[PDB]
Amino acid sequence: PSTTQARVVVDELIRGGVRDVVLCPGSRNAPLAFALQDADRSGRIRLHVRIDERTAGYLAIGLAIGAGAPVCVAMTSGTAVANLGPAVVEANYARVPLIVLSANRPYELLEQLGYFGTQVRASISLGLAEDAPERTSALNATWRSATCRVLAAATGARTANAGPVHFDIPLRVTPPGRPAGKPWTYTPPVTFDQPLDIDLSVDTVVISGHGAGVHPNLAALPTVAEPTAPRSGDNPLHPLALPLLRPQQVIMLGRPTLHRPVSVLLADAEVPVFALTTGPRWPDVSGNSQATGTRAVTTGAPRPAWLDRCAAMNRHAIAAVREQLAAHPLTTGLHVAAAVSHALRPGDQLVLGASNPVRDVALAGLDTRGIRVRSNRGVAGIDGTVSTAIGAALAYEGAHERTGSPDSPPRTIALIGDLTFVHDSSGLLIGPTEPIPRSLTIVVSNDNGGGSRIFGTPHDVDVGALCRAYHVESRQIEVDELGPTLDQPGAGMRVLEVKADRSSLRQLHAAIKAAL
Amino acid sequence: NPSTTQARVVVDELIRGGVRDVVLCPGSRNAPLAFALQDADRSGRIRLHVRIDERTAGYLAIGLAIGAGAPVCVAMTSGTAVANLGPAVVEANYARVPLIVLSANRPYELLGTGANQTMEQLGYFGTQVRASISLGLAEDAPERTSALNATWRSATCRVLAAATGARTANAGPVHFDIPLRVTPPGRPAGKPWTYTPPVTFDQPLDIDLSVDTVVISGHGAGVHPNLAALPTVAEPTAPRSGDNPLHPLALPLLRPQQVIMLGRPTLHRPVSVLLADAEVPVFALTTGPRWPDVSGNSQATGTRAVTTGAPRPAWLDRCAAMNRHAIAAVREQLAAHPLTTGLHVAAAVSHALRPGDQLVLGASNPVRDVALAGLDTRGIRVRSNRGVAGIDGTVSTAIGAALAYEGAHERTGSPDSPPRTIALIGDLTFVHDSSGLLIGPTEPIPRSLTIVVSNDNGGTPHDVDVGALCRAYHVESRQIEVDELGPTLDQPGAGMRVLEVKADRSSLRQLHAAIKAAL
Amino acid sequence: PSTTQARVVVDELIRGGVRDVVLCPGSRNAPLAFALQDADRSGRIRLHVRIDERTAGYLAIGLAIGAGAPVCVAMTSGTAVANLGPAVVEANYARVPLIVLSANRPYLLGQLGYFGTQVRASISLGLAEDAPERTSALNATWRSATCRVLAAATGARTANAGPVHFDIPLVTPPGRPAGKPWTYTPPVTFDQPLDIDLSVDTVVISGHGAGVHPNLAALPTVAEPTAPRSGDNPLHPLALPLLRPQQVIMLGRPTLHRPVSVLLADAEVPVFALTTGPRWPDVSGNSQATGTRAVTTGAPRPAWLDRCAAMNRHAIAAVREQLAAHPLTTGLHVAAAVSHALRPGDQLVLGASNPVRDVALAGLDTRGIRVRSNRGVAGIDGTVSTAIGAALAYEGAHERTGSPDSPPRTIALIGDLTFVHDSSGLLIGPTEPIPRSLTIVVSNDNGGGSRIFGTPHDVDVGALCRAYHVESRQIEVDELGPTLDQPGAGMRVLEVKADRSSLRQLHAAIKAAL
Ligand SMILES: O=C(O)c1cc(O)c2ccccc2c1O
Ligand SMILES: O=C(O)c1cc(O)c2ccccc2c1O
Ligand SMILES: O=C(O)c1cc(O)c2ccccc2c1O
């Protein structure tokens, strides 16, 4: 009955592309849980159990963005809906395929908040398990057809806009699917196409933010790329050089969210802005977005005096940051961010906390080509980054495992503030039988704050003892140790603490601004 | 004045966005937008329609949107006025109609304070609406007049790009709430503040036409030249891709190995009966992100199909024979039937149709009765509220579609008579939406509208002088026999007229059983 | 099967006080349609069917406010929820016990957003499990849940009545003896006292949903029509600008009359809001305090009482004289005529635009008569069917008195725009109940307080009633009183044409005469 339909949707979930499922122990959602662990024992899926329902949501977000695959979370309590709120809100604004699973009880009379209405791509409730053995083969099709609907809506198969989905199974040999493990209803990924005429030769600077696509025809133009954005060309432009120049056009890739000059440039009424997104949503600053497109058709090529003015200032800004950082006495988050950037090698995965770390890496001018950079930029919360990295590693390392290469699994390196660490410190607690990453190292830049009693809050938390209590490898190191100790393999998961200073950081940026 | 500057700006961008008609319902909080709309109508930039009842006003907008294809905006005040658009918004959702509900509201600061005519307005429609966008309360800040304009125009384009499906390929209703307590110019050349070019959603799919395949064309289906030769059971509101029709009654008598499902087929229990048959694979080809669960065995979904081979000529001859067999059963029993029924009048209307006409059907019986008579849709624009298939607003939707089709013809510049718009509705739907006939003297009236009502008890009792209704709203009405329908429809008359045909609902079961028995 | 659940759910409604259920035919069969038919045939409930879903909801509102009992609406279509919106919003803002019935089938899923904002509670019964042994306890939970719906609808525990959504998913088990409800919940006594000094010059503004306060009977009170009067010292609304009250007592939820809002929004006048429910209104946040009753200190200054009564008389005369001096027949004249024709025990239903204001200007005395208006949202829709429902519930309660005297007449004064809005509500099948003493007075003027501001429609109201087989007469104002006394059909209308052009001149004369 109920268990027959639990096993069938799990088979179709795997067929649809689901590889990892997150789960919290609770009273409800027992039959679906058993069908999951049946598949986890077999090895068709990998199961992850956590106590904290909040961090499980972010863990699922990590598993999703790690390999770009749909990930499920199993709700088993009345607290789970509220706790998964933060993760579901991120998955909505970051377009992360997150399938939230529930088991409502329909034979009882008549909790849930209203964010499910605003955040979720589709709230789909399956039918009740029926005692109609003659019709079960007919009930199979709808169960597998409905499961394809939540998979298509989560991955944005027809909308080109991935996001979270609410899947509800009511609760009072398995029927086979199609041959060759194919999904019941196969919908190929849609190609969302919308061209836009753009005269390249006009002085153009390209701002690529979160969710940005790659356009090879824009590879030559000078581009200010956020860490999370992929890079189409090899002509970088530092974010701090932007005020020095006065562009006449701006191509906007995705959802840029960083840097005060970017906000003012896109808001300038005299400068027209063209936004190129991969999904139906398009951003605007002060309503200055002039046109929206999937891609741009390009007429001409920019004049090299523009090209060389930008390229010179780009070197001017990068040198000013590199020079002024060396001049500074104490180690700061910008120094720590620069330390991680120099120590990175292609094939790595980089996870950044959504506060200062992502900002600082851009200031350090990190080159991201060959690197996969992940950050919870949809809502920009300081929550759940520890679990996001753990999940990102587990999804990334799992791809290498299936890849079959006999290589050391790629490193996953995370950079988070102390406030981010303490928030999600509970994400470090993992059961012995639950999957644990093999090459994850979380750099914690402790500055006792982020960016006098309220603005910055001191906590005096012993990060080392906290890591010790959860049975994870920790080591307090100085800046120069980072690059060396990152290369040296240790435990599969380790936390590297680096002390930092805030008082000196304020003057440092003034010195950076004075050398420009 | 902030409220008037806001109103005149969002009206300008809506006009720039392709809004040619605007339905308006007057009230206290409606003033700033009502003035802005009047200056746009008096200047000839839009054609405004004032209606008294908001519910039928929303349906008047649906017709204006489907008759030409442009986004239509409606304006009303706070309170029960916006609630009256529930039924219209619900229909626009399932029918993908670019309806911009523009509501004036007392400031949100007053919500919960007990102020008269205020309610939980924003989000009233919930998930039925494509997007609920709220304009900021226009603040007294002339130092930012150049900045407030950009955000106002940028937001209006979002309302327009959402209602028309400019980037989602999924049109539908949008809730635009504006609280209220030289006009700043837009872009040069009259272009939208934020331009959105034509979008394409593409999902090709390998389909083998050699396999015995039938096509089921539903509401909102696209035209696919690859499938023009296949036998298609096409609903009236579905555009026909070819000249190989298949009657729906013929579908159960055939054995297809394959079925292509265009749009959203709703009609016909046999279609639903066949869709559940698992052995036959189903291929759903839609135009937008939505695709129907009417079949549980849907193998795959897409936007278009790439074909391999061609259907066997034996298969084509089999279906054509069955199609002719089903039409003959309908013809023979209808002629053999002594009395005149709702199917009789439905067959008469279809025969009097000529290419270039616009057919508007009551969503319950007429659509079924027209498809059973097997009307040829080619060259004819068939409109019906098939989103929710409610009895509401059929009259107003025919009126708007007439006004939209006629006005679109006047823009062609061709110097001939405006094309006919004739509608077929039952008495029950007619008496319900009788409020829609009421058009003010200054408001646009259709030039060639003929509402054909097929009166019978029901279709529980009601006895109603249909002529007295039309007299109450000053609409010319004559009562006709079934055989005189064609000639009267052929002879043009007033700009808007009603033709009532008395029909009998008793023998409907006797007639239907004969057709099923004649197969 | 599920019919046993349906049979007991209706039984608890009848036990709880439901006496009228409104129904519409639709796409899927009605929730508990069979159980209602038998109760209708047995005479335990009266049943009204309608084709228009929007009219049906407003009809139920009248059925609820006519006598004060909860009323159910059973709706069975995809357009059903959208069409009840306006009536449900009105029920919420007027605190009307309206129950809405649903029957969702939970064996696949995936309704507007107003249901969360408007209904006092949303309860769905458990699906009827097919098990005979546990039906003893299953009867109890069924009847426990139906009482919850009733208690939420009538505000039995919350003192705030309103709309409720009840969903029943798809011999009879007995209730408690003596036909009493399963879960007995008595009407709660919501109490909140407030110290008010009556020595200070105080005026009382009583609006929709106000309560009666005998200790406040002495004060001069500007009372809306739908407000119950608690004293014999009235004060015309047009005397308010000529007075300087140092205190204002706000009974209920006032809406009408510009001067009250100016006085209620005065920063320098303390406003004490006395309500019968948890909600309280404010105008520009000037409500210094809230309560349910007043504990009084002192008495009003006789000079203050003198002046108030003096200005009340002066305002009474100004409108009566300018009404007479004015040549043409305005909407104020028909409103004044209807007011003079009323007799104690009558029921009056007022359209939400000018009629509810105009009868207030004519100085109507509501003592002894029951006044009704859809003031929660002040909507122009559903007025004729609200009157129909009010007349039906009113006559039914009078019929339950058993008295031999003729049923009390229900009179309704509505504008033309409100008439054509709800014209469809007139079509009532012979199968359905029809009022016996309902009289509808239509003040026709092609709009009321210019292509947009006023909508000229030029409708034949006589031909429209002819169409719906309703008795109609186009009389004059002088003859309104006599025709109104002489009884006619159970449902009859009287259309009196009125001019809007002379209105600006007439109101100016009253301003000049004040
Ligand atoms: O392109 C993206 O990835 C993207 C993602 C989002 O979550 C957005 C939310 C609001 C507006 C625009 C958005 C957007 O362009
Ligand atoms: O493509 C369409 O026209 C269309 C439109 C809709 O509103 C639908 C609603 C539910 C299910 C399928 C739908 C569909 O296929
Ligand atoms: O007492 C009433 O009738 C009543 C009714 C309402 O709907 C209110 C809404 C907001 C604030 C006060 C309210 C109020 O006092």
From Swiss-Prot, chain B:
Signal peptide positions (record): none
GO cellular component, one term: plasma membrane
MF (Gene Ontology): 2-succinyl-5-enolpyruvyl-6-hydroxy-3-cyclohexene-1-carboxylic-acid synthase activity; magnesium ion binding; manganese ion binding; thiamine pyrophosphate binding
Pfam families, sorted: TPP_enzyme_N
InterPro entries listed in its UniProt record: MenaQ_synth_MenD, THDP-binding, Thiamin_PyroP_enz_TPP-bd_dom
Top EC class of this enzyme: transferase
Cofactors demanded by this protein: Mg(2+); Mn(2+); thiamine diphosphate
Keyword flag rRNA-binding: no
Co-factor: note: Binds 1 thiamine pyrophosphate per subunit.
Pathway connected to this protein: Quinol/quinone metabolism; 1,4-dihydroxy-2-naphthoate biosynthesis; 1,4-dihydroxy-2-naphthoate from chorismate: step 2/7; Quinol/quinone metabolism; menaquinone biosynthesis
EC numbers for this chain: 2.2.1.9
GO BP, sorted A to Z: menaquinone biosynthetic process
Keywords: Magnesium, Manganese, Menaquinone biosynthesis, Metal-binding, Thiamine pyrophosphate, Transferase
Reactions that this protein is recorded to catalyse: isochorismate + 2-oxoglutarate + H(+) = 5-enolpyruvoyl-6-hydroxy-2-succinyl-cyclohex-3-ene-1-carboxylate + CO2
Domain of life: Bacteria
Additional free-text comment from the UniProt record: Was identified as a high-confidence drug target.
Quaternary structure (record): Homodimer.
Family: Belongs to the TPP enzyme family. MenD subfamily.
NCBIfam families assigned: menD
Function field: Catalyzes the thiamine diphosphate-dependent decarboxylation of 2-oxoglutarate and the subsequent addition of the resulting succinic semialdehyde-thiamine pyrophosphate anion to isochorismate to yield 2-succinyl-5-enolpyruvyl-6-hydroxy-3-cyclohexene-1-carboxylate (SEPHCHC).
Entry protein name: 2-succinyl-5-enolpyruvyl-6-hydroxy-3-cyclohexene-1-carboxylate synthase
